[PDB]
Design a protein around this ligand. Structure first.
Ligand SMILES: [K+]
Ligand SMILES: [K+]
Ligand SMILES: [Mg+2]
Ligand SMILES: [Mg+2]
Ligand SMILES: [Mg+2]
Ligand SMILES: [Mg+2]
Ligand SMILES: [Mg+2]
Ligand SMILES: [Mg+2]
Ligand SMILES: [Mg+2]
Ligand SMILES: [Mg+2]
Ligand SMILES: [Mg+2]
Ligand SMILES: [Mg+2]
Ligand SMILES: [Mg+2]
Ligand SMILES: [Mg+2]
Ligand SMILES: [Mg+2]
Ligand SMILES: [Mg+2]
Ligand SMILES: [Mg+2]
Ligand SMILES: [Mg+2]
Ligand SMILES: [Mg+2]
Ligand SMILES: [Mg+2]
Ligand SMILES: [Mg+2]
Ligand SMILES: [Mg+2]
Ligand SMILES: [Mg+2]
Ligand SMILES: [Mg+2]
Ligand SMILES: [Mg+2]
Ligand SMILES: [Mg+2]
Ligand SMILES: [Mg+2]
Ligand SMILES: [Mg+2]
Ligand SMILES: [Mg+2]
Ligand SMILES: [Mg+2]
Ligand SMILES: [Mg+2]
Ligand SMILES: [Mg+2]
Ligand SMILES: [Mg+2]
Ligand SMILES: [Mg+2]
Ligand SMILES: [Mg+2]
Ligand SMILES: [Mg+2]
Ligand SMILES: [Mg+2]
Ligand SMILES: [Mg+2]
Ligand SMILES: [Mg+2]
Ligand SMILES: [Mg+2]
Ligand SMILES: [Mg+2]
Ligand SMILES: [Mg+2]
Ligand SMILES: [Mg+2]
Ligand SMILES: [Mg+2]
Ligand SMILES: [Mg+2]
Ligand SMILES: [Mg+2]
Ligand SMILES: [Mg+2]
Ligand SMILES: [Mg+2]
Ligand SMILES: [Mg+2]
Ligand SMILES: [Mg+2]
Ligand SMILES: [Mg+2]
Ligand SMILES: [Mg+2]
Ligand SMILES: [Mg+2]
Ligand SMILES: [Mg+2]
Ligand SMILES: [Mg+2]
Ligand SMILES: [Mg+2]
Ligand SMILES: [Mg+2]
Ligand SMILES: [Mg+2]
Ligand SMILES: [Mg+2]
Ligand SMILES: [Mg+2]
Ligand SMILES: [Zn+2]
Lengths: 84, 50, 71, 119, 101
RNA sequence: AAACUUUCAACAACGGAUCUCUUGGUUCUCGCAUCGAUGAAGAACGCAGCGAAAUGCGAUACGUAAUGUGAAUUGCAGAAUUCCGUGAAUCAUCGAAUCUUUGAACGCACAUUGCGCCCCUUGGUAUUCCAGGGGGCAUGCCUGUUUGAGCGUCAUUU
RNA sequence: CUAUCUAGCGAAACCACAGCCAAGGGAACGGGCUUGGCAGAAUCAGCGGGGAAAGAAGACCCUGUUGAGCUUGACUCUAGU
RNA sequence: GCUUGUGACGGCCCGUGAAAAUCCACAGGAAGGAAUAGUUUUCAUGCCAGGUCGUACUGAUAACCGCAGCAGGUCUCCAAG
RNA sequence: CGUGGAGGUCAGUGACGAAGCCUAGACCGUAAGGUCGGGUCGAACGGCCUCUAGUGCAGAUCUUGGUGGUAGUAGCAAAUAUUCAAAUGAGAACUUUGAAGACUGAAGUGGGGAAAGGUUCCACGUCAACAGCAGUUGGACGUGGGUUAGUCGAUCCUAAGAGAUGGGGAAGCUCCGUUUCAAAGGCCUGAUUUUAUGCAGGCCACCAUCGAAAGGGAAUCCGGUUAAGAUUCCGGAACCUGGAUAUGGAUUCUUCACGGUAACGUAACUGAAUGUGGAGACGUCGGCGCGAGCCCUGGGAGGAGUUAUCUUUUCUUCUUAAC
RNA sequence: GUCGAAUUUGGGUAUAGGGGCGAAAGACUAAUCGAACCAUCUAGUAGCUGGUUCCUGCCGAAGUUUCCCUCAGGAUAGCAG
RNA sequence: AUAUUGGCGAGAGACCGAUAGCGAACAAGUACAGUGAUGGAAAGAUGAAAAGAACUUUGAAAAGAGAGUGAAAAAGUACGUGAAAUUGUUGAAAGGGAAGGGCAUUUGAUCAGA
């Protein structure tokens, strides 16, 4: 036992999908994601985990709003219209 | 499991829709460094891991 | 689906995944001017929703399909 | 070639709503046709016309609400200027230009003078 | 260099009491005006086994002196106490087996 | 003597070294200060005539509006060439919008696309039930508003 | 049923270079060195003498001013009390 | 006769062998009830609606885990002569 | 001596062929090396004077990648077993069909499910790779189709337990605690109907929420139907919940029923607060009784098998759901 | 060996690393246990092992003295350029 | 005035030139592994232009032989050049239990200088 015969007994998921990060790190019984720390308000990250921080940091997504802030600052956060 | 959550079925549907070869009109585009579908998945080779 | 239309008086629609049976019945009634006997819904393996809408006996689903352009 | 927003801006909201309804009917009939006809690209033009009509309708509604809220404080938040959060929390120009009476008196009495050396 | 078993018992992880089948805490009535000054009569409805306890428990039903309802109490049954027996509890109750004095 | 083994050469193999390329990296310097409850970063799921991805976007979905430029896009199909024009474009710019489900995440929950409450409105006789549409209901704290509690306590009636 | 032969399929361990001995001397037990014996292509099935065969930077022993598990009135402390 | 359900019993315990949602009944008499008329949706019939998500297939000497189409492991129902 | 890069110079070399590479061809140096010829090749490169360094490999059980001998070798030998013909096909030990021989032998190699997988289900086309032989076949490849519920589950309940709030601890991430030292509440209605509302008559809470697809639980069965769905579709026949309801029935002149001694009966046969009780709701084993399904078996009404001989014979249909 | 109760087992749940859990073997705690796994400190230190890349020319040793928690090391003198 | 391995916008280098340089020049924090925390690659180059080989023939087909395009197919998407290990064919040579090497010369082949 403890090898091939015992690997056959693996049919109960310790982790499922996390609502916040989707990594399948949500511990079913602890109700906590081992990756992003959900449902804690802060997102889990550690300075010893520099590679994990770089994997999950700003810019790894599509930056739906942040990507236009630089252009809006360059234009001075104007509010009117181009006025042909 | 035949009794699945909607989240699991939704991920299953996305995997089914993206389980296809590279479209043939690609490989005709101007630069087209893409040769084949490098992200192809099969149930017999790599598990989705949910 | 076309066999169902021809034989069972059932129109087969792809419907919004947010729509329930009340919404599907109301939308079919409004868009096609037919009373709906019964709506059955399933989520297909491709993540879209299919609706089998059996109309009342007063309407021919084949005629409705021909009117709306698919035969 | 689709609808034009400058042509839609000349119409009333009833005409825009009816045009949107006709465009939705046209899109529905076009996606019915798409089942048989292969590679039918008119649905893209119809979709963009629907988008343009909805955009003009929203523009008219928001301009009407802006006129309803003109001049009075507490405009709706989505009608207020969207600067950054810090910029909207920053002191207005009146604040941080406020000075005490003593400071105003002394800065009037002794402002920075203009002086040049001539040797 | 390892935590011993009697040290591990204090954490109460696998060493807690198995209380699922227990009838409830065995307590006398709350010491109230009736028991402080006179007595109150209840009725032994059941003599029942309590899981994890050698002694049987007696379910004694009293009347609530302040609201119209019954108050069931879980006494530890004394030998000779029987169902249907009237139990008297208070300063003025008689010296009889099962009475609370 | 053949075969076989070994050495060398030519050609052909295996393999991808070398050389030459380089829309990449690395380091230095200079300039600037701009995320988020007006919902950020991140995530899930979707969106194209034909796309699996990258990139873009959100049911107005490789996008709408506005401005500039001035005739494209392109792999095919389609459309157009009025294109001497408020007008092509997978253009640039970008100040108006849309922005699914989420997420600090905010009605309560969430291994559920689970379960409520309130307002307006629509249909089914319908204030009560069911359903559709629109708008809302988190916590802590600050200022103010209103309604209150306390023989904590003042005055008055007494 | 293998092993064997055939059709198809087709690895791995290991490999300084390789592979006949005797004695000598030699790091004191050589496949090579010295002196002799000898020595003829290409091979097949077995075999377990040898390759001080392979598998692993010996676990035994010792050294290191290298650890760790455990113990104790070792030294120095410490939670608790 | 086998499988299974059930009934009334009997043996055993220093073991006496869940909880809650929910449903009903009873006590009580608040209240509302008749006479050119009242009561009764626990009687019968009649009308309307019942949303959302899952539903295919394997479940193993090939659909799960064990690097694999691995003699391993992986819970259970039916069960002919 | 040689290498990458840098300053100067040779107005150096070069698509009429730079660099690189191959070359038992030649020359020079003791050597590190340098030079030339020939072939290949295609875009840069060199001599000299200096500067500079990530500057020279045979090893490190070195790193990465590639490749051998072993070697067409070890081997592809558990699970009783395959054979004949035809079809298809270029090609058949392996596909399909037919015939035969066998096995699993109901604690199956059968028919379904839970976890898990995620389209492997089914059809068509199809064999470059995979199926350690093969392949026309496939859980493969390519393109499509397919999962239909008021009644089956989730959803609801609580279990062990998890866990906000009020509070307390902790520098803090957060920890404790789950009714606790809390002003924790809306549903019934007289009156309000200046509005069925707040005030104001009058009744009730030792408490969020999560936690079971095997526990608890409202209600569906039969027949047929697909290539692939079925307690879901179709046909027929029911049931439950929520709501609205109009008749009939019942009751009342003794207003809220009668009968039976009684156990109790009924088509009904008013019933708020509050309280009480029951069901939900329960171990294991043993024998006995009964029911269902299966098994065995008789007659008869059909079909099929054997029939040199015997066998009123062997096998098979004769069924009845929820309500 | 055992096979009807200290029985076997699914699911849910709790206990987490000097911690748990242990009918006690230092056993088990995801092929990891006399202290799991993951990342960082960390390129940890090593008097110890291995390796350490072109040519030619000239010169050319030591294993000895003293001291050291020193005896596989260093300092020192000596030998050498 | 000072700091700034983050963000935005620029200018540069005696830096690296695809086993280098960030892990990632490319659909790179991607594919993939792990229950999880995390771990984490490989992978650039036809040609100026697809002009990406019409057509014929053999084969069931893949492909081959031609033909053709192209400056070049000694550039055929298994694509710039194309080393070595290792391999096939041809040619030459040698070979009684290794092979390889040093000095010297015979023989065969080949070749410079005059
Ligand atoms: K640079
Ligand atoms: K140890
Ligand atoms: Mg283990
Ligand atoms: Mg667990
Ligand atoms: Mg359904
Ligand atoms: Mg948003
Ligand atoms: Mg010898
Ligand atoms: Mg000797
Ligand atoms: Mg030897
Ligand atoms: Mg000899
Ligand atoms: Mg042997
Ligand atoms: Mg031997
Ligand atoms: Mg050693
Ligand atoms: Mg060792
Ligand atoms: Mg020492
Ligand atoms: Mg130590
Ligand atoms: Mg049984
Ligand atoms: Mg099924
Ligand atoms: Mg099945
Ligand atoms: Mg089975
Ligand atoms: Mg597997
Ligand atoms: Mg360099
Ligand atoms: Mg050249
Ligand atoms: Mg050579
Ligand atoms: Mg070139
Ligand atoms: Mg170096
Ligand atoms: Mg080397
Ligand atoms: Mg060396
Ligand atoms: Mg090596
Ligand atoms: Mg290697
Ligand atoms: Mg063999
Ligand atoms: Mg074998
Ligand atoms: Mg066999
Ligand atoms: Mg066979
Ligand atoms: Mg057959
Ligand atoms: Mg047998
Ligand atoms: Mg048999
Ligand atoms: Mg199949
Ligand atoms: Mg094969
Ligand atoms: Mg084959
Ligand atoms: Mg397929
Ligand atoms: Mg049910
Ligand atoms: Mg807590
Ligand atoms: Mg629950
Ligand atoms: Mg159940
Ligand atoms: Mg089926
Ligand atoms: Mg039906
Ligand atoms: Mg009666
Ligand atoms: Mg021991
Ligand atoms: Mg080092
Ligand atoms: Mg000398
Ligand atoms: Mg000393
Ligand atoms: Mg040594
Ligand atoms: Mg790299
Ligand atoms: Mg290349
Ligand atoms: Mg060339
Ligand atoms: Mg190649
Ligand atoms: Mg090449
Ligand atoms: Mg070679
Ligand atoms: Mg020989
Ligand atoms: Zn997460």
């Amino acid at each position: 036992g403890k090898g091939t015969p015992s690997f056959g007994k693996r049919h109960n998921k310790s982790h499922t999908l996390c609502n916040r990060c989707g990594r399948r790190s949500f511990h079913v019984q602890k109700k906590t994601c081992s990756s992003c720390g959900y449902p804690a308000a802060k997102t889990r990250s550690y300075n010893w985990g520099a590679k994990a921080k770089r994997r999950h940091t700003t810019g790894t997504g599509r930056m739906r709003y942040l990507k236009h802030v630089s252009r809006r600052f360059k234009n001075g956060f104007q509010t009117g219209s181009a006025s042909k | 499991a035949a009794q699945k959550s909607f989240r699991i079925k939704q991920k299953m549907a996305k995997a089914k829709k993206q389980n296809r070869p590279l479209p043939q009109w690609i490989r005709l585009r101007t630069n087209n460094t893409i040769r084949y579908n490098a992200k192809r998945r099969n149930w017999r080779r790599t598990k989705m891991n949910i | 689906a076309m066999k169902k239309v021809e034989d069972g008086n059932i129109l087969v629609f792809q419907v919004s995944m947010k729509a329930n049976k009340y919404q599907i019945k109301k939308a079919v009634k409004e868009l096609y001017e037919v009373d709906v006997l019964k709506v059955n819904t399933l989520v297909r393996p491709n993540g879209t929703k299919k609706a089998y809408v059996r109309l009342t006996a007063d309407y021919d689903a084949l005629d409705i399909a021909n009117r709306i352009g698919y035969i | 070639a689709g609808v034009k927003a400058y042509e839609l801006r000349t119409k009333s909201k009833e005409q825009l709503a009816s045009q949107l309804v006709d465009l939705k009917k046209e899109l529905a009939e076009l996606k019915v046709q798409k089942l048989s006809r292969p590679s039918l690209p008119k649905i893209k033009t119809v979709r963009k016309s629907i988008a343009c009509v909805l955009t003009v309708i929203n523009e008219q509604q928001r301009e009407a609400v802006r006129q309803l809220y003109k001049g009075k404080k507490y405009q709706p938040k989505d009608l207020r200027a969207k600067k950054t959060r810090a910029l909207r929390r920053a002191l207005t120009k009146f604040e941080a230009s406020q000075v005490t009476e003593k400071q105003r008196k002394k800065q009037i009495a002794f402002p920075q003078r203009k002086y040049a050396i001539k040797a | 260099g390892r935590v011993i078993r009697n040290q591990r018992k204090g954490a109460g992880s696998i060493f807690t009491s198995h209380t699922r089948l227990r009838q409830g805490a065995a307590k006398l009535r709350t010491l109230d005006y009736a028991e402080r000054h006179g007595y109150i009569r209840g009725i032994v409805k059941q003599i029942v086994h309590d899981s994890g306890r050698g002694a049987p428990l007696a379910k004694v039903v009293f009347r609530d002196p302040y609201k119209y309802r019954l108050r069931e109490e879980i006494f530890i049954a004394n030998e000779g106490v029987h169902t249907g027996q009237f139990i008297y509890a208070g300063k003025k109750a008689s010296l009889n087996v099962g009475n609370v004095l």
